[PDB]
Amino acid sequence: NYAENRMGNMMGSFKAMFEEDAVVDVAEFVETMSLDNAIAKVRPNALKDHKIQFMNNQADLSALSQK
Amino acid sequence: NYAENRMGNMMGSFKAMFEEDAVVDVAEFVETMSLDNAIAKVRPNALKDHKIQFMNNQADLSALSQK
Amino acid sequence: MIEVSEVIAKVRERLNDNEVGNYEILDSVLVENINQALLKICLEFRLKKAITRSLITEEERFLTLNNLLGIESVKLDKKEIESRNTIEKDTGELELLILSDRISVTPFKIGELEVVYYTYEEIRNILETIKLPKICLDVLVYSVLCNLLEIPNNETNFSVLANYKQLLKLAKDNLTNYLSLMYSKNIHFSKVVRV
Amino acid sequence: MIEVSEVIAKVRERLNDNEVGNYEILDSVLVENINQALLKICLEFRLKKAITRSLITEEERFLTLNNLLGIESVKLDKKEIESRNTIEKDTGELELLILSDRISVTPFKIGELEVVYYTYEEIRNILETIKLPKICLDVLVYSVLCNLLEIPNNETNFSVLANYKQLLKLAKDNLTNYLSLMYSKNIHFSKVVRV
Amino acid sequence: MIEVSEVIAKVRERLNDNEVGNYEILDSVLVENINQALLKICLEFRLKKAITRSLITEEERFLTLNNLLGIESVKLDKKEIESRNTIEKDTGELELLILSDRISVTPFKIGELEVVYYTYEEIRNILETIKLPKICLDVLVYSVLCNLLEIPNNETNFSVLANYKQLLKLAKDNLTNYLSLMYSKNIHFSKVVRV
C-alpha cells in the first residue's frame, strides 16, 4: 500500500527548490504548474537567472516497482 | 531483516552535506525536502553558490537486493 | 506610502544635482519621469488591482476607466465575457470592446459590467505622496535614474546606466520577494494532478 | 494619449539640443521623424485596427482608405474574400485588388466591402496629441532618437545609436507586456488538440 | 541590540566623512538610508515575526498593522483563512483583504483575526537603538554603504560598490549561520517519507 501510494504521488507531481524572489505569487505558479497543460506566465527576465530548480522526482519509480 | 529495513531506509530518503550557512532554518528545509512534492523556498542567491551537496543514497540498492 | 520628496532628493543626489539654486533638471521633468516610472512599475508587477462595477445602457454605452493597464476579469450580469477586441464587431460571440480607456461590450447588450483592471494613481505635484510599499522606493529611483542618465552630460553615462540597470534588477528582485510574501500562499508542497 | 510636446522635449533633451533659441533640428524634421516612428510602431505591433464598411458599384469601383498598413479580413456581402492581388485579373476566383491605398475587387462584382485594416493617424503639428497608450512613449522617443543620432554630429554617434537600440528593445518588451495584458485572454492552460 | 551611533560611525569612517564639523552627508540622509537597510534586511531574512489578535465587527472593519512585510498565517475564530486578495470580492470563498497596511476579510464576517506578520521597528533618531542581533551590524553597514557609494563622488565608485557587494554577501552568510543556530532544529538526519 505504501509503495502504490508513494508511486502514485511520485508521478503526477513535481518538486522544485525556489528562491524567495524567483516569481511573484509562487503559490499561484505551483498551482498552474501542477497541470499537464501548463501556461505559466512569469515576471520578465525570470528564465535567464535560474532561480527555480526543478528536481527529479522519479528517481525511485523502478526500484519501488520491483520491490 | 537488516537488508529489507536498510533498503526501505535507502529509498524514500535523501542525504546531503550542508554548510552551516547554507540556508536559514535547515531543519525546516530538510522537513519539506523529505516529501516527494517539495516546494522549498530558500534565501536569495542560494542556488548559485552550491553550499548544499546532495549525496547519492542508493549506491547500494542492487547489491543489497542480490544479497 | 512613499513621499515624492524623498524620491526626488535621492535622484538629485545621484545626478550630482543636489543644488537648491541651480536645478539643472526642472521639477516638471522629474515629475513626468516619475510618472513614467510608476507606469512601468505598476505594469510589470501588476501592483494595483481595481474593481469597477457600473451599468451600461442604450443612453451611455461606454465605461470610462482611468489609467488603464490591463483587464483580467469581466462579468456582465454575472456572466463571463470571454474575448477582447477593439473593432466594434456587429454580431456574433459576446466580446469586450476596448477604446483606449473606454470599455463597452461589442455586440451591445443592456446590462452591467464588473471589470477588474490595473491603475496608476500617478502624481502631479512634488508635495504629493505615492501610495506604494516602501520597498518600492529603490525601484522607483533606479528606474527613473536610468531614464535621466542618458542625457549626454558625460561621455561615460552609458556605462553608469548599465551599472544602474543591475542595481534596478536587484531592487526588482527585492520587490518580488515582498510581493510573494504578501499576496501569495504560504505553501511548501504541490498538489497531485487530478484528471 | 501622448502629447507631442513631451515627446519633442525628451528628444531635444537627449540630443543636447534643448535650446529654445537655436533649434539646430527644425521642428518640421522632428514631426516628420515622429510620423516615421508612428509608422514603424503601428506596423510592427498592429496597434490600430479599423473597420470600414462601404459599398462598391459600377459608378465608383474603388474604396479609398487612409494610412493603410495591412488587411486582415475582407467580406463582400458576408462572403469571405480569399486572395489579395494588385494586377486586375480579368476573371477567375474572387480576389481583393489593392492599389496603394485604394481597395476594390478584382473580377468586379457589385456589392459591399467590409474591410478590417490598420491605420496611422499621423500628426502634423507640434500642438497635436498622439492617441496611443502612454506606455508607448519610450518606444516613440527611443525609435525617433535612433533616427536622428545617425546625423554625423559626433564621431561616436553609432555606438550611442547601438545603446539606444537596446533601450528601444526593452521599451518594446514593455509595450508587448502591456498589449498582452490588455487585448489577450487571461488563460493559464492550453486546450487538447481535437481532430 | 545595536546602537545607531556605531552604525553611523562606521559608515562615516568608510565614506571618508568622519569629520564632525563638515558632515557632507546629512544625518537625516543616513537615518533614512538606515531605515531602507532595515527594510531590506528584515524582508529578506524574515527577522521579526509579530502576532496580532484583534476583533473586527461591522463598526470597524479593518485592522491597522504597522510596517507590514508579509503575512504567513491568518486565523478567524480558529479557522484558517486561505487566499489573499486586494480587490474586495463580493462573495465566494473566504479571503484575506490587504489594503496597504490595513487588514480585513473580503466577504466580510463578524469575528476576530489572529494574524502573523513581519515588522520593521524603524528608527528616526541618531540616539535610538536597533533591536537586532549584533551579528546584524556588518550587514547593516555594508548594505547602507552600497546605497551611498553610488553618489558620484569618485570615478571609481562602482568598483568599490562591487567590492562592498561581496563583503555584504559574506555578512549575510554569517547572519544566516547565526539564524540557523538560533531558530532551527539541531538535527543530523532526515526522516523517511511516509505516504
Side-chain angles (χ1 to χ4, degrees), chain E residues 2-187:
Chain E
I2 316 178
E3 321 276 350
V4 193
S5 86
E6 62 205 301
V7 185
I8 287 302
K10 292 174 78 68
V11 176
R12 295 283 189 179
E13 291 156 49
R14 263 55 146 182
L15 274 190
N16 219 5
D17 186 74
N18 215 26
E19 179 42 69
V20 185
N22 199 8
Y23 269 23
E24 197 48 75
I25 290 295
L26 271 299
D27 283 318
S28 74
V29 177
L30 294 174
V31 74
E32 190 277 331
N33 277 264
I34 281 183
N35 282 328
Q36 264 304 300
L38 282 172
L39 182 62
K40 292 186 293 191
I41 294 169
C42 292
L43 163 70
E44 158 158 0
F45 281 103
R46 280 92 164 150
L47 283 173
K48 305 183 100 83
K49 286 188 57 186
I51 174 66
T52 187
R53 184 201 280 81
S54 175
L55 197 145
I56 48 169
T57 187
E58 268 288 349
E59 191 72 282
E60 63 284 343
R61 211 171 288 192
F62 274 90
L63 200 153
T64 305
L65 286 172
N66 212 54
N67 289 325
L68 189 57
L69 290 173
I71 312 155
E72 67 91 20
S73 191
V74 178
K75 317 283 301 310
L76 189 149
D77 313 328
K78 290 338 181 183
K79 176 57 70 208
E80 268 302 329
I81 301 299
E82 182 65 26
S83 314
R84 290 150 208 194
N85 212 352
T86 74
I87 207 65
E88 179 57 286
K89 173 194 66 177
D90 53 279
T91 194
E93 65 183 1
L94 183 63
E95 317 176 13
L96 181 68
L97 207 60
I98 297 89
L99 271 297
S100 61
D101 189 359
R102 292 183 291 113
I103 288 308
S104 163
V105 182
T106 300
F108 181 75
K109 184 163 131 153
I110 301 299
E112 62 92 19
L113 269 186
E114 194 173 276
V115 190
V116 190
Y117 67 100
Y118 307 94
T119 300
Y120 300 174
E121 65 183 1
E122 73 193 317
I123 73 169
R124 292 183 291 113
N125 197 283
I126 319 290
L127 314 175
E128 268 184 287
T129 300
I130 304 180
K131 308 166 59 62
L132 277 191
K134 293 196 191 64
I135 187 75
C136 295
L137 166 66
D138 274 331
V139 71
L140 281 173
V141 173
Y142 294 160
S143 81
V144 69
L145 204 53
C146 301
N147 214 28
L148 298 173
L149 277 176
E150 60 86 19
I151 312 286
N153 288 334
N154 206 323
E155 60 155 9
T156 70
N157 53 357
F158 274 120
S159 65
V160 162
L161 194 143
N163 286 314
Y164 272 123
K165 290 298 273 311
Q166 313 184 0
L167 262 66
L168 165 66
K169 188 161 68 55
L170 297 195
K172 282 169 169 180
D173 291 331
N174 278 261
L175 186 45
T176 301
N177 197 342
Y178 166 83
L179 295 184
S180 286
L181 198 50
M182 293 298 291
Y183 306 121
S184 179
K185 294 297 292 182
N186 189 358
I187 62 170

Side-chain angles (χ1 to χ4, degrees), chain C residues 115-147:
Chain C
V115 190
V116 190
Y117 67 100
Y118 307 94
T119 300
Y120 300 174
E121 65 183 1
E122 73 193 317
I123 73 169
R124 292 183 291 113
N125 197 283
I126 319 290
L127 314 175
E128 268 184 287
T129 300
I130 303 180
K131 307 166 59 62
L132 277 191
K134 292 196 191 64
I135 187 75
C136 295
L137 166 66
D138 274 331
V139 71
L140 281 173
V141 173
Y142 294 160
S143 81
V144 69
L145 204 53
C146 301
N147 214 28

Side-chain angles (χ1 to χ4, degrees), chain C residues 32 36 39 43 46 68-72 82 84-87 90 98 147 150-152 158 165, chain D residues 10 14 16 49-51 134-135 137-138 142 163-164 170 174 177-178 181-186:
Chain C
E32 190 277 331
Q36 264 304 300
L39 182 62
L43 163 70
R46 280 92 164 150
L68 190 57
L69 290 173
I71 312 155
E72 67 91 20
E82 182 65 26
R84 290 150 208 194
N85 212 352
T86 74
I87 207 65
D90 53 279
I98 297 89
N147 214 28
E150 60 86 20
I151 312 286
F158 274 120
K165 290 298 273 311
Chain D
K10 292 174 78 68
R14 263 55 146 182
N16 218 5
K49 286 188 57 186
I51 174 66
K134 293 196 191 64
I135 187 75
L137 166 66
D138 274 331
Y142 294 160
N163 286 314
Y164 271 123
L170 297 195
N174 278 261
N177 197 342
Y178 166 83
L181 198 50
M182 293 298 291
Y183 306 121
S184 178
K185 294 297 292 182
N186 189 358

